[PDB]
Amino acid sequence: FMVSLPRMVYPQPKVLTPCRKDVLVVTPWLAPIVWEGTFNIDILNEQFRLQNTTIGLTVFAIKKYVAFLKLFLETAEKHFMVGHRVHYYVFTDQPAAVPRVTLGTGRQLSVLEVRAYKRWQDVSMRRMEMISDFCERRFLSEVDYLVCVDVDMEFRDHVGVEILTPLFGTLHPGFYGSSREAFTYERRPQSQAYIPKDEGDFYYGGAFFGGSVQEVQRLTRACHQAMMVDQANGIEAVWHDESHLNKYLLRHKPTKVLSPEYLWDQQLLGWPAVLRKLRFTAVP
Amino acid sequence: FMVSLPRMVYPQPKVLTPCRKDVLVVTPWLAPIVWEGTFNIDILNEQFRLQNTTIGLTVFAIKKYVAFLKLFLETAEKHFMVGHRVHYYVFTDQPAAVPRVTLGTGRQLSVLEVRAYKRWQDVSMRRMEMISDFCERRFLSEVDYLVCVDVDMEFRDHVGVEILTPLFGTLHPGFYGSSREAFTYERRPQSQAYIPKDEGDFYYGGAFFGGSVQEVQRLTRACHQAMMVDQANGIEAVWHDESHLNKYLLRHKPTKVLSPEYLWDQQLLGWPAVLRKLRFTAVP
Ligand SMILES: O=c1ccn([C@@H]2O[C@H](COP(=O)(O)O)[C@@H](O)[C@H]2O)c(=O)[nH]1
Ligand SMILES: O=c1ccn([C@@H]2O[C@H](COP(=O)(O)O)[C@@H](O)[C@H]2O)c(=O)[nH]1
Ligand SMILES: [Mn+2]
Numbered sequence A, B: 001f002m003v004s005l006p007r008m009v010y011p012q013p014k015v016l017t018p019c020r021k022d023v024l025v026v027t028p029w030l031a032p033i034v035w036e037g038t039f040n041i042d043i044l045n046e047q048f049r050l051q052n053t054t055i056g057l058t059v060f061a062i063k064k065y066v067a068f069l070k071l072f073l074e075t076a077e078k079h080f081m082v083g084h085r086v087h088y089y090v091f092t093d094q095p096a097a098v099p100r101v102t103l104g105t106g107r108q109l110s111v112l113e114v115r116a117y118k119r120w121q122d123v124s125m126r127r128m129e130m131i132s133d134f135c136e137r138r139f140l141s142e143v144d145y146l147v148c149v150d151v152d153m154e155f156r157d158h159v160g161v162e163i164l165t166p167l168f169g170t171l172h173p174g175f176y177g178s179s180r181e182a183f184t185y186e187r188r189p190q191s192q193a194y195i196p197k198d199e200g201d202f203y204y205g206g207a208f209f210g211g212s213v214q215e216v217q218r219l220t221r222a223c224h225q226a227m228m229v230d231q232a233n234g235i236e237a238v239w240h241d242e243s244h245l246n247k248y249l250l251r252h253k254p255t256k257v258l259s260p261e262y263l264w265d266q267q268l269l270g271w272p273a274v275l276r277k278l279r280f281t282a283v284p
């Protein structure tokens, strides 16, 4: 049950004025595509605070990637869900190496020890298993939404409750302007992640996805179970977990899509006019 | 739990091409505003059919307004949720006067007898009470969504599952291009429906709203309970049920907004370029 919003003064939405004239702001299945200019964060903050929303943020820092945690967490404190309850979940093989980052009120961090796989591909892939196992262990009881990201990144601008929805994916920065045939989906029919050349809405990035705990457990379990089928058949998808994520989100459409503002690499791609904000970016 | 979509071939969405350049297609709270060109009905039909969705449609035909039923129902059969399960609920003081309209498969009609109020204003207002009472009686057990409309109307074009969402309102055709100060909200602070001149997102029409059964029961109960407070205080809102609906949807934002394609009057307003389809229109 949702309590009433208070009186708020803000600009009237104008029906005959598009909010963006340069980009698609809604998918063909009526999911919003989140760009700057599409939302009034004051309204959304009120809606989510009245629900006392808690957001979980999972990040894996295994082997040398522990070096990325300090900047990741410091910048999350400046930009990620500020004003809301946040629970960071740091999965690592080196609990002792997690930096002591000072957190704002209503924010907490748990360190979860996991095994390290030898190949980076298996480290990246086995996040799905680990996230889906922790959905029972903790997440169902502790958070309303989960956001699952890569650690070799930093926040540079606001990432807030505009992203929250039952299931979201993010447009990969390398492909948002590409035609589907150019998308690096898995193309071998032998793999569970196979997508034909004439199918595909978007190429979603494996480095940023999330949703409600229930929808994330469904996604991660499905991707893990597909990976295990492939492994039994002696095949590894071309882009690992990202390939399985794309298969899942083709067949189970997200309820919001994040623009590449939310997953960017300035070294490789610069700062195009279409991006008004670079929010979460690669560490070069 | 949502089963996987089958393979489908359809045009790729292009991220750098707006779907409409002449209208707002998403509210500032990230609710889609449904216009032609914003959705692929093939995808949405698949999603809703895989859930075996049933849609209820309530309509009141009291006193002389029984004359409108034949065209209303005949045209609903041509255009409303075709392919999906539909349950019409006709509330009337003259059960015997409901026309025998032939229905397609998976579609049914129930006639619910109710009392007739003397004043048209009370007929229109007391729909809220009657809808909220029937949410327990029947709707919770029989349908997934409810659509609540005026009867003095006809369908001329597709009205389908693109509208379905937890809570929707529709832009009133007289005000979609107006500034909020011109909106005919209730402006007397003595009324529960009062909205100040500096508040308001849109002017929603009382002739077309809906959502999930739970959200419609909440809306209709709140509007009824506000009407009863006003009555006790000797005040009747300027636009009756529509005024209370607007107060509710200001404080409880809809999760989709329908464009005026869904609520139109060609006699008064013609056929502007911005309307690509006139879907549900006034009988002159
Ligand atoms: O040795 C590794 C390999 C990958 N990852 C995690 O998996 C993510 C995806 O792998 P990558 O493509 O960024 O290497 C990394 O950002 C990091 O969170 C590790 O922690 N350690
Ligand atoms: O005598 C009346 C008055 C109103 N209505 C119902 O209430 C709706 C709203 O009233 P109106 O403004 O269209 O008259 C009508 O479309 C019709 O569904 C009736 O059935 N009979
Ligand atoms: Mn990386």
Ligand SMILES: [Mn+2]
Pocket (backbone or CB within 6 Å): B150, B152
């Ligand atoms: Mn009327």
